[PDB]
Amino acid sequence: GNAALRYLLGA
Amino acid sequence: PIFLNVLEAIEPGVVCAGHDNNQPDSFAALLSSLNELGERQLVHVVKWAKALPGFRNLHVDDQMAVIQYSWMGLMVFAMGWRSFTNVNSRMLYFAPDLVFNEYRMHKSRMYSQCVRMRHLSQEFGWLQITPQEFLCMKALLLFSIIPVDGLKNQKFFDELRMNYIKELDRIIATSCSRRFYQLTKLLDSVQPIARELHQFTFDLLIKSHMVSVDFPEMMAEIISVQVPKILSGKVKPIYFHT
Numbered sequence: 129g130n131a132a133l134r135y136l137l138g139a
Numbered sequence: 140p141i142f143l144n145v146l147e148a149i150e151p152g153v154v155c156a157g158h159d160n161n162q163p164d165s166f167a168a169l170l171s172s173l174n175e176l177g178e179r180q181l182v183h184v185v186k187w188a189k190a191l192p193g194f195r196n197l198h199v200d201d202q203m204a205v206i207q208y209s210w211m212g213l214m215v216f217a218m219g220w221r222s223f224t225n226v227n228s229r230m231l232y233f234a235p236d237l238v239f240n241e242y243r244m245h246k247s248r249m250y251s252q253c254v255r256m257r258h259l260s261q262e263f264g265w266l267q268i269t270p271q272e273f274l275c276m277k278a279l280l281l282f283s284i285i286p287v288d289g290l291k292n293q294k295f296f297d298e299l300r301m302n303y304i305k306e307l308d309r310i311i312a313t314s315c316s317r318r319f320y321q322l323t324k325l326l327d328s329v330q331p332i333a334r335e336l337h338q339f340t341f342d343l344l345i346k347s348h349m350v351s352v353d354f355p356e357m358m359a360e361i362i363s364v365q366v367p368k369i370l371s372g373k374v375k376p377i378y379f380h381t
């Protein structure tokens with residue numbers, strides 16, 4: 129999974 | 140009303156590339172700027188998608204997926220609209236500080252791809268696409284590419300997609316059928332263009348270390364993990380026409 133992307137999604 | 144009010148409200152504002160226009164054009168500088176702009180736009184795509192009607196109803200892994208697969212097409216479509224509305228398709232308006240004329244199209248070595256994007260931009264004027272039609276189509280573009288092995292919860296995705304197509308019908312409403320025909324053709328035309336760019340960026344990432352082109356972290360990862368799935372036929376766009 130794209131760590132940086134998932135962060136933005138759940139941020 | 141409601142649906143269109145939302146799309147207009149969440150539409151991202153202007154995004155700059157941070158390109159140095161005072162320096163002479165170079166392959167590496169233009170592509171590095173495009174990549175940085177791509178990263179910046181990806182950030183805006185996530186914030187935008189998160190606020191779309193029904194998007195959070197999708198499984199989280201599917202939210203990630205459609206964003207990662209649709210990113211290129213979404214950027215191409217929006218850029219085509221910006222070019223049309225800001226310079227009447229004369230040039231490619233990637234950003235206020237990154238406008239591509241024919242010389243840059245050639246220097247970047249993406250000429251053939253740029254000509255195709257310029258054509259898409261001209262279609263917005265030829266078809267007299269309205270700002271509201273543009274918004275609904277762009278939203279539908281996010282739900283136009285999926286894995287052949289299916290999504291975590293394909294049912295919810297299909298329902299969301301169906302609802303966006305319904306909204307497009309309402310916006311359109313023999314005249315209606317003719318309009319739906321041209322808009323769906325326009326939407327389909329985005330896919331081949333995005334595929335060409337997918338191939339181009341993939342090749343560029345593979346040799347970036349030798350051509351001195353920098354790729355931001357998120358992009359590099361999407362391009363090395365998700366893009367190949369598209370290029371290898373594992374993930375394919377949903378075309379209206381064959």
Ligand SMILES: C[C@]1(O)CC[C@H]2[C@@H]3CCC4=CC(=O)CCC4=C3C=C[C@@]21C
Binds near residue numbers: 339343
């Ligand atoms: C330069 C490159 O790596 C290849 C094609 C490029 C694409 C072309 C389409 C595009 C349109 C925009 O308005 C945002 C930036 C943007 C890009 C940014 C980086 C990419 C992916």
